[PDB]
Amino acid sequence: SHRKYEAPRHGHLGFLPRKRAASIRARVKAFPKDDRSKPVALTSFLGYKAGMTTIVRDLDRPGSKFHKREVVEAVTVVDTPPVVVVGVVGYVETPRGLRSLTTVWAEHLSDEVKRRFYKNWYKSKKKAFTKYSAKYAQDGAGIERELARIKKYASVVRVLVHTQIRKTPLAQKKAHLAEIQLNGGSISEKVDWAREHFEKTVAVDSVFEQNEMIDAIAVTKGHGFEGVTHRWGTKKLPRKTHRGLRKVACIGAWHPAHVMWSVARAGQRGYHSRTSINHKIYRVGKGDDEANGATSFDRTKKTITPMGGFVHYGEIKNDFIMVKGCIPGNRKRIVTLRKSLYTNTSRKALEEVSLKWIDTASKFGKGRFQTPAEKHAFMGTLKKDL
């Protein structure tokens, strides 16, 4: 017989399987559609999620009850030191999809980017791209040929880049290597751009501009094996339930004589690849700049890093992006910032955002002070400060 009372199904069947992602670093499954008229531009950047903080800004929404009024908003800080271009990839389109015909690398490769190719780096002869470097060191001995191949073929061109893990305060020393598609001009122009930027370091401001609506692609936080009650948000069984209550009671009918794929079951929760769209860039801050967290209303010489540093992460001594809201992934995790795949107006994407105040109080508890100057101003002299 039918369900006695209708209720919506628990979970989303389009996010299946709820398995562990293939790696820490989530790849861009699709890049923005190419337009030849626009200049050659990177469509993505790589950052490391440092933490969240608070901003206060004057909202400009003509018709909301909070029009021209201060609003407090959560933001995510992504530490984005400039990424190095090392190599490019050309994709020829075939009746079976895009196929990479060749990959040309740079002359010299960074130690972190070869640590990427290694696993037992210390017990290694570091023989990596040595014969490729020998193939290099001339004008076009074996490199202009590969570039000309990518120009003659390979309607899609992607540049191989890597992160500066050494700049970023983690303990990894192993750069993250990825591709970013060049989405402007001709294939020849894209190859020219890649050649010019070989071994060159691109900063986040060149690709991402303030008040942009971008996407974050990252692997969400892992939570191990989970029961169905939390993994799917099913109703808990009544208290007097023999053999357990954090379960799904009926996992199927008698017929079909199988458990269906759409029935909620226990297993891994989190550590999934996610692509979350329409996050507004609130600030693109420069690393070589004190008063990073200073705006036109606050004007205090303070940096984005909270008092005592970002929890579990550290400091933001590099360039950073402050995006509105939350993003997939946890702190210390590599995230990919991708340009929007469509032109969104929404009257809300177009909203120009001026930050009036950035929180820098300690996140390691209930911090009352933004700067050590303000802390000392409030608390005067301590016994330890003779």
Partner: protein
């Protein structure tokens, strides 16, 4: 934005932090955090709580004012 003071502890309350409480007599008590909010609900005296701005003022501590 502006910085409010704790009605109990006398601490600076930056936007978002703490809570606001409206008593029955429509009096507003803004707390920097749950510590001061709980001490207030416990009918505790700020002048008798040692680390409170009111305590230091009553005891002539921090006479820099």
């Amino acid at each position: 934005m502006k910085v409010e003071i704790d009605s109990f502890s006398g601490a600076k309350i930056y936007p978002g932090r703490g809570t606001l409480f409206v008593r029955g007599d429509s009096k507003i008590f803004r707390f920097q955090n749950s510590k001061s909010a709980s001490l207030f609900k416990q009918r505790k005296n700020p002048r008798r709580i040692a680390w409170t701005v009111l305590f230091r003022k009553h005891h002539k501590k921090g006479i820099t004012e």
